[PDB]
Design a protein around this nucleic acid. Structure first.
Ligand code: SF4
Ligand SMILES: [Mg+2]
Ligand SMILES: [Zn+2]
Ligand SMILES: [Zn+2]
Lengths: 370, 189, 422
DNA sequence: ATGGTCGTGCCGCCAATAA
């Protein structure tokens, strides 16, 4: 409906209704088998109001440019004469939601720093947590303003986790991991935002994941330690940061097709697709191993407004890019097996309200390896 | 009965931290009559002198992995065709629904059923809760004298505390997330 | 807000645990059943009736007199209990009237206990639109009201207040010329307002019950609520020990038939004939046989007319009281083994023959049969030696080395068992 | 004061054989 109002489309057509004249269809892209999606096997599954949940194959031969992944909601213009196959003629571009409107109070603030680190915080064969230790040292030396720590603090793929060779419960392992940072960052005085990850073995394996539970916090610590669920959209100094721990880049780009491969930017097009589908996880169906509860997916996994900065850790290469006027940052993991990873630090201020509309508050980003 | 309800449940397995021999926990106690001793008292290996009750951390940790495996298996969403001739197994949930439920995409006349029903998950969770619930295991005895004899010989306050720790490890998952909650609004409105 | 009496509308929206879900239903059933006993054994005006009913209401944590503020818990209890019980007693027409009569009686009791002066606000809190009259208005129309009064003796207009109602709502009164009508408004004594309140409650209760029954198939889809919707009306030789004999003296076949009748509240034709003839064999007469069958079939939510014109003829004929008047002998074990093989939906036949070992094993297990005896019985069954296996079953359940007889008839089984047991 | 074949709703009647 939002895309219909944006593009001023008169009406939609059911999938099963034949039509010689070109018509516009509304549906979701999907695959007809359990294998990898290909251009030949793309099907469109319609809405229940119009198509009563039907599915028809689509032909992309007559389409100049396209980029499709399962679970994407688009409006497809094409011809469906026999009522069993739809041939494309034009594919509508996704329309992102308008940016957040800054208030007059947000424009009176000063320079702000956001340091971002993502798990794991140890090498893949040792438990000394030395990457966590020198990360805390870097935090102390930096004296930043906000410190966003993503999971997995206790990785579900660490070989000692599944061999049950430890002498302490992961519940207690959570307490020592917390108090490590807690007494390591007291001198810095920076706010701490701990966001869980789906790889947190000790916590509830539900996407979205609830905020962590911890009671051993002093009065000073409660003013500096804040627990935020995963995923979430947090306003830091009037800037909407989209915090997510899922490797959404690997969720999407691993099962997405495109028409151009010579000169095209991949990470940018996945980021655009994420920003245009108005959800934290458009992929339907997901891969083999990740649990999502759909009941709260509709109410806790959508974009209220388009976030000004996206923080999307991934196992792929680190990158900071401006897509659709939004600065997306991918610092990756702090530790990658036996080779070190990267973290990020971002500058943010609110410029003058007047100007050429769009003005990115986060002018500067710097991803540095730990 | 409890025996028939938990027959299909997978038995909880956990290696011994000392000797490595796999143990068996199918009930709170093992044996019958006078030799009805707790399953957590001694290791299954005869030569092993280490008490599994001491290794409560490892037992709870292995329970954690087992329950995570089960819940991920449930959320996998695997569906199976009811027709013996079709036996269609798909991960994608079709939007074509019949009166009973989803309609198979391979054969046009059949109802897809979940591979792991919610009843199976709840029964497995209840079995895990019951195998470490000494409170209901002690009241099951018909004689108070035998109950006191078994309580004062092994069920020390520390032993009861460890059993309650296992029960609370189960109850953390069984407490808020559930199935026993019935919404009256959906039932009436 | 006056949580001590309430017209039941606006269904709730809270969520509860299933244990409380069953506890509320059983408590409401118990209270509503005891209302029957109180209304039958006593009369509606004695102090003992009020005392017993209010004591029981106190016992089961249910709302009563409004003088002590925050009894929110009893309010919630009653509100949930009525709606949860609406689903069960809306199926059969023999239960809807039973529900309505006793709920109206309970509302009458709750109405009689309101002290004197909180009644006015309640009438506005139930969407009734009634009114009272001041003392000067009462004195103005005193003669008119007492003249318009019913056969109520005396001219004394007592302290009982007079209520002012729209005329259309007083149809049962002004039709008989028993009230006063002025400017399209009826004036009634406080005694008669109870009748109109209950009469107006009855129609809404019946409408709600009807509208719930037709949209109740959607609720049966839930597998956790099936026991509740079907077991709220469940539960020389006499009637009150046969169940015990099912565990003690019956052979496995007839025990299986009795279990089927106890659980499913119905039986097919073969099981009916077999069990009825055996039950004649043990010694029952016609009267208690009819009692037993009708009691076991009414619990299937069928009215007695259907049973009387359907099965009574066959039951009577089984004993030889119609037709040629021929009395029959209970089935011999050979015909049970060889004649009329069972099918799907049927529970008759010999378990030692028709039941596969993959089911016969747990059939023995559920009856506390020793594993060695189980193996011996399975070996005997594999050898097609059924009677000796049944004899071995008898010995194992009777704790004797040898029975001392040759078995060819279940009635012989029962008589031999009762020879030693009694 | 044509033939036969098919289904639907009311009733009454029967099987059984140790000890
Ligand atoms: S052998 Fe005869 S008496 Fe025994 S269970 Fe079978 S039918 Fe019944
Ligand atoms: Mg019949
Ligand atoms: Zn051992
Ligand atoms: Zn099929």
């Amino acid at each position: 409906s939002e895309l219909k109002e944006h593009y001023k489309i008169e009406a939609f057509t059911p999938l099963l209704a034949p039509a010689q004249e070109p018509v516009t269809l509304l549906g979701q892209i999907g695959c007809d088998s359990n294998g990898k999606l290909n251009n030949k096997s793309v099907i469109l599954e319609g809405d229940r109001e119009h198509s009563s949940g039907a599915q028809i194959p689509v032909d992309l031969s007559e389409l100049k440019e396209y980029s499709l992944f399962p679970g994407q909601v688009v409006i497809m213009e094409g011809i469906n004469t026999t009522g069993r196959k739809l041939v494309a003629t034009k594919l509508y571009e996704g329309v992102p939601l308008p940016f957040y409107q800054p208030t007059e109070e947000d424009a009176d603030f000063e320079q702000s720093m956001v340091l971002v680190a993502c798990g794991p915080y140890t090498t893949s064969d040792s438990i000394t947590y030395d990457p966590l230790l020198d990360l805390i040292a870097v935090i102390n030396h930096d004296r930043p303003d906000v410190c966003i720590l993503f999971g997995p603090f206790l990785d579900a793929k660490h070989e000692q986790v599944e061999n049950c060779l430890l002498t302490s419960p992961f519940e207690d392992i959570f307490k020592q991991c917390l108090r490590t940072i807690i007494e390591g960052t007291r001198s810095s005085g920076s706010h701490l935002v701990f966001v869980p990850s789906l790889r947190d073995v000790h916590h509830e394996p539900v996407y979205p994941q609830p905020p962590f539970s911890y009671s051993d916090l002093s009065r000073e610590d409660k003013k500096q330690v804040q627990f935020v669920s995963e995923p979430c959209s947090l306003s830091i100094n009037g800037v909407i940061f989209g915090l997510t721990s899922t490797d959404l880049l690997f969720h999407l780009g691993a099962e997405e097709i495109s028409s151009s491969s010579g000169t095209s930017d991949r990470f940018s097009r996945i980021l655009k697709h994420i920003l245009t589908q108005r959800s934290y996880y458009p992929l339907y169906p997901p891969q083999e191993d990740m649990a999502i509860d759909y009941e709260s997916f509709y109410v806790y996994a959508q974009l209220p407004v388009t976030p000004d900065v996206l923080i999307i850790p991934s196992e792929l290469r680190y990158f900071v890019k401006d897509v659709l006027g939004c600065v997306c940052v991918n610092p990756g993991r702090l530790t990658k097996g036996q080779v070190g990873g990267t973290f990020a630090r971002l500058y943010l201020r609110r410029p003058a309200a007047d100007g050429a509309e769009r003005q990115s508050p986060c002018i500067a980003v710097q991803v540095v390896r730990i | 009965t409890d025996e028939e309800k938990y027959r299909d449940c997978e038995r909880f397995k956990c290696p011994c931290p000392t000797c490595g021999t796999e143990n068996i926990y199918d009930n709170v106690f093992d044996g019958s009559g006078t030799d009805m001793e707790p399953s957590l008292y001694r290791c299954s290996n005869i030569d092993c002198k280490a008490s599994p009750l001491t290794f409560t951390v490892q037992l709870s940790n292995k329970l954690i992995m087992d329950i995570r495996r089960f819940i991920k298996k449930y959320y996998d969403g695997w569906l199976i065709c009811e027709e013996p001739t079709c036996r269609n197994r798909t991960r994608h949930l079709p939007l074509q629904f019949s009166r009973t439920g989803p309609l198979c995409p391979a054969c046009m006349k059949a109802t897809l059923q979940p591979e792991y029903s919610d009843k199976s998950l709840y029964t497995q969770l209840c079995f895990y809760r019951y195998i470490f619930d000494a409170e209901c295991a002690l009241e099951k005895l018909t004689t108070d004298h035998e109950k006191d004899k078994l309580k004062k010989q092994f069920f020390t306050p520390k032993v009861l505390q460890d059993y309650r720790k296992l029960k609370n490890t189960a109850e953390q998952f069984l407490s808020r997330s559930g199935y026993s909650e019935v919404n009256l609004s959906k039932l009436f409105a | 807000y006056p949580h001590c009496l309430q017209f039941y509308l606006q269904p709730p929206s809270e969520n509860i645990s299933l244990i409380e879900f069953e506890n509320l239903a059983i408590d409401r059933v118990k209270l509503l059943k005891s209302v029957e006993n109180l209304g039958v054994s006593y009369v509606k005006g004695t102090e003992q009736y009020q005392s017993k009913l209010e004591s029981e209401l106190r016992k089961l944590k249910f709302s009563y007199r409004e003088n002590l503020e925050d009894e929110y818990e009893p309010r919630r209890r009653d509100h949930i209990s009525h709606f949860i019980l609406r689903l069960a007693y809306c199926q059969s027409e023999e239960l809807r009237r039973w529900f309505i009569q006793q709920e109206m009686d309970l509302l009458r009791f709750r109405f009689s206990i309101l002290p004197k002066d909180k009644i006015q606000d309640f009438l506005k809190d139930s969407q009734l639109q009634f009114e009272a009259i001041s003392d000067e208005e009462k004195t103005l129309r005193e003669q008119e009201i007492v003249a318009s009064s019913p056969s109520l003796s005396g001219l004394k207009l007592g302290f009982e207040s007079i209520y002012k109602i729209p005329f259309a709502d007083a149809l049962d009164l002004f039709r008989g010329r028993k009230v006063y009508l002025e400017d399209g408004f009826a004036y009634v004594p406080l005694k008669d307002i109870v009748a109109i309140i209950l009469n107006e409650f009855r129609a809404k209760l019946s409408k709600a019950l009807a509208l719930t029954a037709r949209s109740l198939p959607a609720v049966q889809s839930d597998e956790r609520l099936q026991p509740l919707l079907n077991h709220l009306s469940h539960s020389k030789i006499s009637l009150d020990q046969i169940d015990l004999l099912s565990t003690k003296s019956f052979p496995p076949c007839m025990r299986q038939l009795h279990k089927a009748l106890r659980e499913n509240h119905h039986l097919r034709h073969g099981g009916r004939m077999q069990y009825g003839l055996f039950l004649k064999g043990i010694g029952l007469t016609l009267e208690q046989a009819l009692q037993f069958w009708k009691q076991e079939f009414i619990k299937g939510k069928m009215d007695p007319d259907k049973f009387d014109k359907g099965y009574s003829y066959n039951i009577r004929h089984s004993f030889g009281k119609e037709g040629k008047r021929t009395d029959y002998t209970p089935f011999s074990c050979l015909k049970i083994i060889l004649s009329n093989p069972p099918s799907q939906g049927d529970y008759h036949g010999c378990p030692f023959r028709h039941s596969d070992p993959e089911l016969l094993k747990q059939k023995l297990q559920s009856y506390k049969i020793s594993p060695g005896g189980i193996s011996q019985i399975l070996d005997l069954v594999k050898g097609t030696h059924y009677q000796v296996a049944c004899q071995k079953y008898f010995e194992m359940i009777h704790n004797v080395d040898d029975c001392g007889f040759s078995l060819n008839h279940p009635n012989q089984f029962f008589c031999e068992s009762q020879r030693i047991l009694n």
